Amino acid sequence: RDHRKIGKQLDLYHMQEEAPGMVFWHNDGWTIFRELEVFVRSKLKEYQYQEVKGPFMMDRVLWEKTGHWDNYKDAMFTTSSENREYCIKPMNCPGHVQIFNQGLKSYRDLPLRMAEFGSCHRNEPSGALHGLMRVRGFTQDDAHIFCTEEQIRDEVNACIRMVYDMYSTFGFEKIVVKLSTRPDKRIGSDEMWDRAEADLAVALEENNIPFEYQLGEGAFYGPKIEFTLYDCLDRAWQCGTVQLDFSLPSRLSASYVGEDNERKVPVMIHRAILGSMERFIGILTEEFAGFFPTWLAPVQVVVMNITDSQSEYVNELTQKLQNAGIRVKADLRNEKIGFKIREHTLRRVPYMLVCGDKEVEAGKVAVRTRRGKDLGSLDVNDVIEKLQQEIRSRSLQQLEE
Amino acid sequence: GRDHRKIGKQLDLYHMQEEAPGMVFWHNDGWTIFRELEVFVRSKLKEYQYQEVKGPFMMDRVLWEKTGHWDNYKDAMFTTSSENREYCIKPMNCPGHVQIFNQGLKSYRDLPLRMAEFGSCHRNEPSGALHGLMRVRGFTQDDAHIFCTEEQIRDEVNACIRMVYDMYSTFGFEKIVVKLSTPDKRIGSDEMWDRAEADLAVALEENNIPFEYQLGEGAFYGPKIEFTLYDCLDRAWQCGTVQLDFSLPSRLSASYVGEDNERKVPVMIHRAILGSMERFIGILTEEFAGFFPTWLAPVQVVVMNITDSQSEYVNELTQKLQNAGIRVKADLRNEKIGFKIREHTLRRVPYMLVCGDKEVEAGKVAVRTRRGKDLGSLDVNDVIEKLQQEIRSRSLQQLE
Ligand SMILES: C[C@@H](O)[C@H](N)C(=O)N(CCCCCn1cnc2cc(Br)c(Cl)cc2c1=O)Cc1cccc(-c2ccc3c(c2)CNC3=O)c1
Ligand SMILES: C[C@@H](O)[C@H](N)C(=O)N(CCCCCn1cnc2cc(Br)c(Cl)cc2c1=O)Cc1cccc(-c2ccc3c(c2)CNC3=O)c1
Ligand SMILES: [Zn+2]
Numbered sequence: 001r002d003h004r005k006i007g008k009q010l011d012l013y014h015m016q017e018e019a020p021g022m023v024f025w026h027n028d029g030w031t032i033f034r035e036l037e038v039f040v041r042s043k044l045k046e047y048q049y050q051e052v053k054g055p056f057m058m059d060r061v062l063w064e065k066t067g068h069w070d071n072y073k074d075a076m077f078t079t080s081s082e083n084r085e086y087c088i089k090p091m092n093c094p095g096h097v098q099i100f101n102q103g104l105k106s107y108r109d110l111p112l113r114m115a116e117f118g119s120c121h122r123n124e125p126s127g128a129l130h131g132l133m134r135v136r137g138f139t140q141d142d143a144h145i146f147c148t149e150e151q152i153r154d155e156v157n158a159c160i161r162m163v164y165d166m167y168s169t170f171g172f173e174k175i176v177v178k179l180s181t182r183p184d185k186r187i188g189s190d191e192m193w194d195r196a197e198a199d200l201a202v203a204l205e206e207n208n209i210p211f212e213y214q215l216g217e218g219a220f221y222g223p224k225i226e227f228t229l230y231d232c233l234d235r236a237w238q239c240g241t242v243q244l245d246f247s248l249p250s251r252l253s254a255s256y257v258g259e260d261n262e263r264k265v266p267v268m269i270h271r272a273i274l275g276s277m278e279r280f281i282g283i284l285t286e287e288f289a290g291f292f293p294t295w296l297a298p299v300q301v302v303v304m305n306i307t308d309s310q311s312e313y314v315n316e317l318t319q320k321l322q323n324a325g326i327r328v329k330a331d332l333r334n335e336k337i338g339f340k341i342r343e344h345t346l347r348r349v350p351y352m353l354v355c356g357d358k359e360v361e362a363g364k365v366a367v368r369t370r371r372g373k374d375l376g377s378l379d380v381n382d383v384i385e386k387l388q389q390e391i392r393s394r395s396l397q398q399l400e401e
Numbered sequence: 402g403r404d405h406r407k408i409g410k411q412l413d414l415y416h417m418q419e420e421a422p423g424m425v426f427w428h429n430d431g432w433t434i435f436r437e438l439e440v441f442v443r444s445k446l447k448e449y450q451y452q453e454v455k456g457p458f459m460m461d462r463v464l465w466e467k468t469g470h471w472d473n474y475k476d477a478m479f480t481t482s483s484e485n486r487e488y489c490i491k492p493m494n495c496p497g498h499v500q501i502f503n504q505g506l507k508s509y510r511d512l513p514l515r516m517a518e519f520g521s522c523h524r525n526e527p528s529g530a531l532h533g534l535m536r537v538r539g540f541t542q543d544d545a546h547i548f549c550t551e552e553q554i555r556d557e558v559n560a561c562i563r564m565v566y567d568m569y570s571t572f573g574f575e576k577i578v579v580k581l582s583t584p585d586k587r588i589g590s591d592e593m594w595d596r597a598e599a600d601l602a603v604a605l606e607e608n609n610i611p612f613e614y615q616l617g618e619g620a621f622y623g624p625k626i627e628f629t630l631y632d633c634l635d636r637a638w639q640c641g642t643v644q645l646d647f648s649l650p651s652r653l654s655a656s657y658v659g660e661d662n663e664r665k666v667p668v669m670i671h672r673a674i675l676g677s678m679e680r681f682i683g684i685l686t687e688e689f690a691g692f693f694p695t696w697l698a699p700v701q702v703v704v705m706n707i708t709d710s711q712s713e714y715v716n717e718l719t720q721k722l723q724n725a726g727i728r729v730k731a732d733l734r735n736e737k738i739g740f741k742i743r744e745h746t747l748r749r750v751p752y753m754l755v756c757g758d759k760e761v762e763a764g765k766v767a768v769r770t771r772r773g774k775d776l777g778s779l780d781v782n783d784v785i786e787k788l789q790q791e792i793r794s795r796s797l798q799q800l801e
C-alpha cells in the first residue's frame with residue numbers, strides 16, 4: 001500500500017528533479033484524476049455551486065493587499081514582466097473575489113457559492129516533498145461562499161453535510177472534527193468571534209456531529225472547522241476544512257447592496273473537502289491498494305477470447321460496452337486465457353469478460369473479478385446494465401453471484 | 402455588433418483586468434462553454450485513438466536550454482527561482498510529453514504513440530500587442546505530440562489533416578487556406594528534408610487540399626502545415642498547425658527499440674487544431690454573435706409558467722429535462738410572459754418552454770426559439786428527445 005510503487009506499477013504518474021513536487025500525469029492516472037473531477041462537479045451541481053477558472057498569476061500589488069505577502073512571501077513563486085512583479089497563485093481566494101467584484105452585487109445574489117479546480121503553486125522545500133502527498137504544484141477542490149452574517153450557519157451546515165456525503169463515497173465513515181478558536185493576535189471584536197465560533201459550533205450540533213476544540217489555533221481572520229478521516233489502516237488524514245474570513249472581502253473591496261440599500265461587506269467561507277486532489281488520489285491508492293472502485297478504474301472491463309474463433313464476438317461485445325460508456329479494452333493477443341487474466345488482474349482491472357465457444361453459442365459472457373471470483377456465464381445485456389448501475393451509483397463493491 | 406469583449410460581459414462569460422494582463426477570468430457561464438469545448442475535443446481524441454496526459458506547470462531552465470528554445474525565446478518566456486535553481490513557466494507542452502514517453506521502455510509496436518493534453522501555457526508577449534481572447538499571455542492549447550517511425554509519418558499526417566477539417570466542420574468553418582513552410586539554415590541532410598517536405602506535400606495532394614508554399618518560414622527542426630479558417634466576416638484566423646520535429650526527440654534523449662533491435666530516435670509530430678482554446682471561444686463568440694449552438698449554450702432551456710397554477714408542472718418538466726442531461730433553469734417569478742421571454746432571449750437561451758393550463762391538461766409544452774420562431778405546443782417527451790439529439794449530435798441548426 002505505497003502510492004509511489006502502485007503509481008509506477010499501474011503507470012498512473014511519475015515525477016522528475018527537473019520539476020520537483022510537480023506531477024507528470026500518465027493516461028491511466030489522468031483518467032482517475034478526471035473521474036474524481038466529474039464526481040466533485042456532480043456534488044457542486046447538487047449543492048448549487050458555480051464553477052469558475054482564475055488566472056495562474058496576478059500582480060504582486062494585488063497579493064500585497066490580501067495581507068498574506070509578509071507572512072508567506074518565502075513560499076510564493078514570483079515572475080517579472082515589463083517592470084511589474086507577478087505571483088504564481090498558491091490560493092484561489094483573491095481571483096474568486098475579482099470575479100465577485102465584476103458587476104453590481106445584491107443581497108438577492110447571496111449566498112454566492114463559487115467553486116474551482118484551482119491549479120495552485122507553493123515554493124515548498126524540496127527535502128519535505130513526498131510523492132503525491134507533499135507537492136509544489138497541486139489542485140484544490142476549492143470554493144468560496146459569499147454570504148450575510150445571518151446565512152453563515154446555513155452555509156457551514158451545508159459544507160458539513162457535503163464533507164460527510166463525499167467521504168462516504170470512498171468508504172470513509174470515521175471522521176474526527178476540530179473547531180479552532182480565536183488566536184491571541186486576531187482581527188475583529190470579541191463579540192464577532194463569539195458569534196462566528198458559535199455559528200461553526202451550532203452548525204456541527206445541527207448535523208449531530210461530536211467534535212473537540214483546538215484552542216487559539218484559528219486564523220487571525222476567523223475560526224475554522226478541520227475534518228480528519230481514517231483509512232482502512234486507521235491512519236489519520238487531515239483533508240477537509242471550512243474557514244471563516246472577515247478580512248479578505250474588505251481588503252479587496254468586496255461589497256453588495258443590502259435590503260435597506262446600505263453598501264455592506266460580504267462574509268467569505270473558504271471550503272475544501274478532498275483538500276488536494278493529488279494527495280486524495282494518493283490516499284485512495286493506498287486505501288484500496290490499487291483496487292480502485294469500478295467508476296474510478298482507469299480500465300473497467302477487458303473483453304478477452306480463449307481462441308481466435310471468438311475474435312469477432314469480442315469485437316461486437318467490446319463495441320456494445322463502448323456504446324454503454326464503459327472504459328473497455330479488447331485482449332485479442334495470441335496468449336493463453338490464464339496469461340491474459342493474470343496480466344489484467346495484476347493491473348487491477350475490475351472485470352474480465354471471458355468469451356469461449358459456449359459463451360458465443362448462447363449469446364452470453366463469463367465474468368471473472370480481479371479478486372479471482374467467478375460469477376459464471378450471464379446474459380450480455382443484463383451484465384452491461386449491472387456494470388452501468390455499479391458505475392452510475394459509484395459503488396465501492398463489485399457484482400455479487 | 403459582435404465584439405467578444407462586449408458579449409463576454411453581457412452574458413457574464415469572462416473578464417480581464419490590468420492586475421493580470423492577457424490572463425482570462427472564466428465566469429460560470431463562460432467556463433461551461435470552455436468545458437463543453439474540452440468534452441468535444443476529448444470525443445475526437447478517443448475517435449482518433451489519442452491518450453490524454455497532464456504535464457508540470459514549470460520545468461528547470463537546464464531542460465529548456467537542451468531543447469534549444471532558450472536561445473531565441475528567453476525574452477518571451479516566464480521564469481521563477483527556487484533553491485538557487487531557475488525554472489521556466491512552460492510556453493509549450495512538447496518537452497513535457499517527451500519526459501512521459503522516456504519513462505517506460507518504448508518499442509516499435511508502441512508506435513504510433515498519440516499523446517494529447519489541454520496544455521496551460523504562458524509566454525511574456527508585449528502588453529501593447531494584447532487584445533481580448535485573441536492575443537493573450539495565459540492560454541490553453543488543444544495540443545498533442547505523435548511519436549512515430551519515419552515511414553508512419555504520411556499516414557499520421559493524413560489523420561491530423563482529417564481531424565482538422567472534421568473538428569472545423571462542427572462549428573461551420575468550411576473556407577480553409579493551407580500553407581506548407583519548407584530555411585537557409587537547417588538540421589540533418591537535404592535528402593531527409595526532400596522526404597519530410599514531401600510527406601506533408603503528398604498528404605495534402607491525396608486529400609485534394611490546395612496549399613501555397615511559404616519558402617523560408619518553416620523551422621531548422623523540420624517543416625510545418627498551417628491551417629487558416631475564415632469567419633462569417635471573411636476574417637482570417639491561423640488556428641491549426643502540424644509540425645514535424647527531427648531535433649527535439651534526439652536533443653531530449655528520446656529513443657525506441659526497432660524491429661531490428663536498433664535504438665532509433667522517433668519522429669515527433671506537433672499538432673494543435675483549435676490552437677488557443679480562449680482564442681477559438683473568442684472566434685466562436687463573434688461568429689455566432691453570442692447565439693451559441695444548443696450544445697455550447699451556457700443555459701440550453703428555460704421552463705416558465707403563465708400563472709402560479711402551472712408552477713409544479715414546470716418544476717417537474719425542469720427535473721425531467723435535467724435528468725435528460727440538459728442545462729435547464731425554471732422561471733416561476735411573478736413577471737409577464739413577455740418580460741420573462743425577453744430576458745432569456747437577451748441571454749441567448751436556445752429554447753423557451755412555456756406551460757399554460759392547456760399545456761398541463763394535454764401533457765404538452767409550448768416551445769419558442771431565441772430567434773422568435775413559435776414551434777407551438779408539442780408532446781413533452783418528443784421535445785426532450787429532439788433537444789437530446791440536437792445536443793448529442795452538436796447541431797449548428799435549431800428545430801425549424
Ligand atoms: C480552502 C481554501 O479556500 C483556502 N484558500 C486554502 O487554500 N487553504 C485554507 C487554509 C489557509 C491557511 C493560511 N495560509 C496557509 N498557507 C498559505 C500559503 C501561502 Br504560499 C500563502 Cl500566500 C497564504 C497561505 C495562507 O493564508 C489552505 C489549504 C487547504 C487545503 C489543502 C491545502 C494543501 C494541500 C496539499 C498541499 C498543499 C496545500 C501544499 N502542498 C501540498 O502538497 C491547502
Ligand atoms: C502545435 C504545438 O505542439 C507547438 N509546439 C506550438 O506550441 N506552437 C507551434 C510551433 C511553433 C514554434 C515556434 N515558437 C513560437 N513561439 C515560442 C515562444 C516561446 Br516563449 C518559446 Cl520557448 C518557443 C516558441 C517557439 O518555438 C505554437 C503555437 C501553436 C498554435 C497556437 C499558438 C498560440 C495561440 C494563441 C496565442 C498564443 C499562441 C500566444 N498568445 C495567444 O493569444 C502557438
Ligand atoms: Zn480560500
Ligand SMILES: [Zn+2]
Pocket residue numbers: 493494495546671672
Ligand atoms: Zn509541440
